[PDB]
Design a protein around this nucleic acid. Structure first.
Ligand SMILES: [Mn+2]
Ligand SMILES: [Mn+2]
Lengths: 161, 612
RNA sequence: ACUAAAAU
């Protein structure tokens, strides 16, 4: 019930800890892999999961990221438009995502238009990284091929206005 | 004994033109008591019977609304009772022109009246003032036969005037009531607020002793626009953004500057990543070669708003100065009516003749001759407001005739007229897309093929730039250097007169004949100052007034309120509401607002205490 | 000596 469940989480992509896995609602003899994921999409990765990213992603030594991972979005800013008008037609959309595994923060930059992440995407939304993902300086290149939005609400207020 | 039909026009020139057209050249002229309006007599037929025709003029509004009695004196009244206590009467306008007496001595025995007045709300109001001036002195109309007629027209062309005379109608009383309600609202609100503010400020601050602090439903929002622009200027924080430019070379001589598709990166680290990801490359590939034909589109007809905008922008004239120059030109007979509101030419206009009259001027003689030879292009379809034909030249001129500002305005008007019947400017836009490493760049340029109206408006011209090289997909080119440029977001500048006129048009504040008056008024009351480039810089007086209005009740400055009141006025102009009901329901609301303003004046007091 | 619109 423990080792096989951890294997299932690893296969799915999540690299949580044992305490976090048991924290995700796992009623004995009730649910194994689907409901735990269902509640994990709605609970804070910082309070649940374990680190799996390298030690010094932001340093620049890391050149590629391997393995299918899942991370939590903390902030999304349009780096191609000024702060006063965060949305504008002057420049193509380009979002500077901030992502976390619960322990280490990293930054992702969008090359190709991604009609799955927008300025209206709630913080705490989960993004799954598939395949090899390049990092150039301290920034992870994200496109439509290597990013899948899994949704989720982590009980966060508006933090706006 | 044949009867007489009295016809009235809003202008002496309009009356003369209409009488000449309807007379088929058989016109008799006399001068009236006023000395400006004239009387034109000619024989004809009106209702299947011989009848004399007496055409005359009324110089604008016969009467103007004002308070009657002591209430016109400021020291012996409380402005609070200017709302629902002070009686109002229509006294006179330009009393030196005895217009009422002129109409009475002209319509002494007239059996019919045909109101050849302007087809707008002000036209209908003058229709009814002419009616209540002349109807008492007309002969009694026995039987059910109608004795009052109105003619609906837009142009001053022969067949248009003749058919308009053929199909006559009846004046609309609701539109006159709408105009009267608007006049009462504006008079009461503006005179109450201005009296209060002037009597208050002059009694506490000495630097405003001879000043006139004036509030109005049309100048306060005009000042608010400039104050809002000044607020944007004073509350702007510049931001730093980085743009990558790549310079490539193709023919060993020409160097192409390449623009970035992902323009305006606002993070230094991201921009540095893109630079390090691109500059280590010495070859660029070509992906897209777009060669698309497009046409720059010719202008519409010239309305007063566009003429004022262009005069303020390029000609360097104020709105009131431009209006005065246009009025002088129109009176001298060189330009059509300059207070037109229409961008659409009449379906029956002598465009070819107007161009032919401009066929002996060295600036555009060749262009006019070629256009007449190849046939004029039909003017663009616009908006027909049924007010007046658009501003068009009517007589040839030269610098030796007009001179200076009048010549410049005439030149712009006739160049616009030649352009609006010319061909479109066809230009090929060529874009080449380059790949440098993993990043994209584009290079765009334009090459003209048919100048069209560009020949007569050189300033709406596509710039002359070298044609892009003939490189197809897959061609490789050497890139010299790829550099990152640091730039800052420039702050917006103060409102220009053209932009303010555009905002007034958009929000319905002011009219075609009141925009220059409002701009000049807010300039003369020392609310704004005209700087270099016709920029309206708000003064401390304007800033304190608008900011205090926002603190107390912002609804007195917001542009939308004038539009809302205008909507409620059209409610009775269409007959869907009651004149007295709407009048009272607006007056009481504004009276409550004024009382709140009086009780809460400490806001503006403490806001002005710091700056005088 | 106001407000807003027509007029030369
Ligand atoms: Mn008129
Ligand atoms: Mn008008």
């Amino acid at each position: 019930m423990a080792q096989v469940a951890g294997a299932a989480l690893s296969q799915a992509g999540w690299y949580l800890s044992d305490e976090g896995i048991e924290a995700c609602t796992s009623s004995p003899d009730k649910v194994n892999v689907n409901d735990i994921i269902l509640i994990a999409l709605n609970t804070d990765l910082r309070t649940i999961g374990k680190k799996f990213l390298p030690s010094d992603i932001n340093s620049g030594k890391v050149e590629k990221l391997e393995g299918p991972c899942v991370l939590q979005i903390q902030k999304i800013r349009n780096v191609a438009a000024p702060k006063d008008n965060e949305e504008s037609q002057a420049a193509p959309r380009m979002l500077r995502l901030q992502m976390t595994d619960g322990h280490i923060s990293c930054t992702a930059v969008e090359f190709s238009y991604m009609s799955k992440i927008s300025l209206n995407t709630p913080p705490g939304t989960k993004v799954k990284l598939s395949g090899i993902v390049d990092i150039k300086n301290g920034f992870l290149l994200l496109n439509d091929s290597n990013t899948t939005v899994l949704g989720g609400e982590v009980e966060h207020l508006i933090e706006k206005w | 004994v044949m009867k007489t039909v009295l016809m009235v026009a809003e202008k002496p020139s309009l009356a003369q033109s209409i009488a000449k057209i309807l007379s088929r050249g058989s016109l008799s002229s006399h001068k009236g008591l006023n000395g400006a309006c004239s009387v034109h007599e000619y024989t004809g037929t009106f209702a299947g019977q011989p009848v004399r025709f007496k055409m005359t003029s009324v110089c604008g509004h016969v009467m103007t609304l004002d308070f009657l009695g002591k209430y016109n004196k400021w020291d012996k009244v409380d402005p609070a009772e200017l709302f629902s206590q002070a009686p109002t009467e229509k006294k006179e306008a330009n009393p030196k022109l005895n217009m009422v007496k002129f109409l009475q001595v002209e319509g002494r025995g007239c059996d019919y009246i045909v109101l050849w007045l302007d087809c707008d709300k002000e036209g209908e109001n003058i229709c009814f003032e002419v009616l209540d001036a002349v109807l008492p002195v007309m002969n009694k109309a026995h039987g059910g036969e109608k004795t009052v007629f109105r003619a609906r027209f837009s142009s001053i062309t022969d067949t248009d005037i003749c058919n308009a005379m053929a199909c006559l109608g009846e004046p609309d009383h609701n539109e006159a009531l709408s105009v009267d309600a608007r006049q009462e609202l504006d008079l009461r609100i503006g005179c109450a607020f201005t009296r209060f503010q002037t009597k208050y400020f002059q009694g506490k601050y000495g630097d405003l002793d001879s000043s006139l602090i004036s509030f109005g439903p049309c100048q306060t929002p005009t000042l608010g626009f400039c104050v809002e622009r000044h607020d944007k200027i004073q509350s702007f924080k510049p931001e730093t953004y980085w743009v990558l430019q790549a310079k490539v070379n193709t023919d060993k001589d020409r160097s192409l500057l390449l623009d970035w598709d992902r323009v305006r990166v606002f993070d230094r680290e991201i921009a540095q990543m893109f630079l390090n990801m691109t500059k280590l490359e010495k070859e660029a590939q070509v992906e897209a070669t777009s060669r698309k034909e497009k046409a720059k589109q010719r202008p519409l007809a010239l309305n007063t708003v566009e003429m004022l905008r262009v005069a303020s922008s390029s000609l360097g004239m104020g709105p009131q100065h431009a209006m005065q120059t246009a009025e002088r030109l129109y009176t001298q007979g060189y330009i059509s009516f300059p207070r037109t509101e229409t961008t659409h030419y009449p379906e029956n206009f002598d465009l070819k003749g107007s161009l032919r009259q401009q066929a002996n001027h060295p600036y555009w003689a060749d262009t006019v001759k070629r256009l007449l030879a190849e046939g004029i292009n039909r003017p663009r379809k616009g908006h027909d407001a049924g007010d007046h034909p658009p501003i068009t030249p009517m007589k040839s001129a030269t610098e030796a005739e007009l001179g200076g500002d009048a010549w410049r305005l005439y030149e712009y008007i006739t160049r616009h007229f030649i352009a609006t019947v010319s061909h479109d400017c066809k230009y090929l836009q060529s874009t080449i897309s380059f790949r440098i490493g993993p990043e994209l760049f584009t290079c765009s340029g334009k090459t003209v093929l048919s100048p069209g109206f560009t020949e007569v408006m050189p300033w709406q011209s596509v710039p002359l730039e070298e044609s892009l090289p003939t490189c197809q997909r897959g061609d490789a080119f050497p890139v010299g250097e790829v550099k990152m440029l640091e730039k800052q977001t420039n702050p917006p500048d103060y409102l220009t007169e053209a932009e303010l006129i555009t905002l007034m048009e958009k929000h319905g504040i002011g009219t075609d004949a009141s925009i220059p008056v409002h701009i000049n008024n807010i300039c003369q009351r020392n609310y704004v100052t005209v700087e270099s480039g016709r920029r309206l810089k708000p003064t401390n007086l304007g800033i304190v007034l608008v900011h205090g209005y926002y603190k107390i009740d912002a609804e007195l400055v917001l542009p939308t309120i004038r539009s809302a009141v205008e909507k409620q006025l059209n409610l009775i102009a269409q007959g869907k509401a009651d004149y007295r009901q709407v009048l009272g329901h607006t007056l009481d609301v504004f009276k409550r607002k004024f009382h709140y303003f009086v009780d809460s004046i400490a806001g503006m007091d403490e806001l002005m205490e710091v700056s005088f």
